[PDB]
Amino acid sequence: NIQVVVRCRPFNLAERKASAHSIVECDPVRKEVSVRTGGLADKSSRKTYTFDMVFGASTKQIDVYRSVVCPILDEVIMGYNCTIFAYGQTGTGKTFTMEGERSPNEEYTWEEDPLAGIIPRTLHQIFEKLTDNGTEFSVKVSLLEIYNEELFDLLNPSSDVSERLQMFDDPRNKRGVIIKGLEEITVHNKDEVYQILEKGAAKRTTAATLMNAYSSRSHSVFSVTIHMKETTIDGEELVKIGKLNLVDLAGSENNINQSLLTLGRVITALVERTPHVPYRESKLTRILQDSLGGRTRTSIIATISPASLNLEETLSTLEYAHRAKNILNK
Numbered sequence: 001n002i003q004v005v006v007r008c009r010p011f012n013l014a015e016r017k018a019s020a021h022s023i024v025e026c027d028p029v030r031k032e033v034s035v036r037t038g039g040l041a042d043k044s045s046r047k048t049y050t051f052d053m054v055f056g057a058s059t060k061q062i063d064v065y066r067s068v069v070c071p072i073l074d075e076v077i078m079g080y081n082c083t084i085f086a087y088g089q090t091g092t093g094k095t096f097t098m099e100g101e102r103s104p105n106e107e108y109t110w111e112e113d114p115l116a117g118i119i120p121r122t123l124h125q126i127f128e129k130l131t132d133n134g135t136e137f138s139v140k141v142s143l144l145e146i147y148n149e150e151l152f153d154l155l156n157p158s159s160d161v162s163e164r165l166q167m168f169d170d171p172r173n174k175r176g177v178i179i180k181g182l183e184e185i186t187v188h189n190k191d192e193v194y195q196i197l198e199k200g201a202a203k204r205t206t207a208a209t210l211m212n213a214y215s216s217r218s219h220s221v222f223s224v225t226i227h228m229k230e231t232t233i234d235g236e237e238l239v240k241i242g243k244l245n246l247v248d249l250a251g252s253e254n255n256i257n258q259s260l261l262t263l264g265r266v267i268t269a270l271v272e273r274t275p276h277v278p279y280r281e282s283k284l285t286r287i288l289q290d291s292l293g294g295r296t297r298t299s300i301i302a303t304i305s306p307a308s309l310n311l312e313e314t315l316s317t318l319e320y321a322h323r324a325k326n327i328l329n330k
């Protein structure tokens with residue numbers, strides 16, 4: 001039930017000049033990814049896997065958005081909660097997929113930058129959709145990040161990243177939590193997005209000077225909530241509330257990452273149909289439990305490297321993401 005997809009990144013400059021031989025092969029049509037475990041294109045053994053969708057190195061941000069993100073966003077507009085995880089070793093594309101980058105030399109405005117990822121495209125589209133038709137709506141974003149089991153708010157511009165938020169159980173709706181003091185920044189229009197994203201970027205920079213390998217060891221949860229009061233061409237009015245969570249997990253390669261360890265153990269119990277699911281054993285799984293066997297539509301995008309040097313890690317990632325497919329929620 002949970003939809004899982006694989007994105008393989010292309011070789012980098014340094015890999016090209018070294019005559020890199022990709023040990024990975026993608027077949028979008030057949031929804032298959034193949035990896036050369038033994039070695040040698042003349043003769044070799046390989047490992048094969050099937051997923052809901054597969055994307056090779058030739059895949060651009062726009063293909064990713066039109067294919068996975070557009071449909072899930074439409075659901076969010078309908079009043080549903082959706083989450084999308086990015087999983088994989090550091091250097092494979094988790095941040096590139098989730099956030100995106102800027103093209104060199106100020107070649108494009110942020111809303112037309114082909115290298116832009118899911119977050120900016122989504123915030124830009126929400127306004128692109130609801131504005132067109134007749135819909136009164138409010139957009140609020142939030143960026144919660146977990147490092148060594150401590151919560152941080154990377155969007156609040158009146159407190160630095162030394163102040164870790166506190167987390168409690170929500171007495172109202174069970175299996176839900178309350179993060180004290182987390183900031184919800186309202187986005188009044190498309191032309192207010194970039195700066196808010198710039199804000200988080202800069203705080204993210206101070207977090208990195210303060211915490212070791214911060215960009216590799218932390219989990220970021222960027223949430224976008226949409227309050228809608230749609231008024232049909234007739235005169236009806238729908239009050240819908242949709243929430244989309246975009247998670248850039250900490251690098252899966254292998255001190256300890258309690259949330260990462262716990263996430264793996266939660267998937268295990270969900271697919272093994274084990275009664276006790278260890279949600280409470282980490283901050284991430286308590287924050288996102290409804291995304292794991294709950295009433296939320298969730299998608300996992302596992303990013304892999306083509307380089308033969310990451311064969312062992314490419315296998316763990318694929319194997320890890322293939323098991324997730326058996327998870328059922330809603």
Ligand SMILES: Nc1ncnc2c1ncn2[C@@H]1O[C@H](COP(=O)(O)OP(=O)(O)O)[C@@H](O)[C@H]1O
Nearest residue numbers: 008009010089090091092093094095096097303
């Ligand atoms: N699909 C892709 N297309 C072009 N470049 C990519 C792609 N995926 C990753 N890269 C490049 O690979 C490097 C790894 O980036 P990053 O997204 O930060 O990895 P991660 O988040 O998995 O640690 C970056 O320099 C990035 O520009």
Ligand SMILES: CC(=O)N1N=C(c2ccccc2Cl)C[C@H]1c1cccc(O)c1
Nearest residue numbers: 099100101110113115116119120200201
């Ligand atoms: C380069 C930059 O400052 N960006 N910063 C981003 C960002 C930072 C924090 C939280 C969420 C996002 Cl997503 C992403 C990105 C971006 C935004 C818009 C268009 C792009 O091409 C890249």
Ligand SMILES: [Mg+2]
Nearest residue numbers: 094095096215
């Ligand atoms: Mg990264």
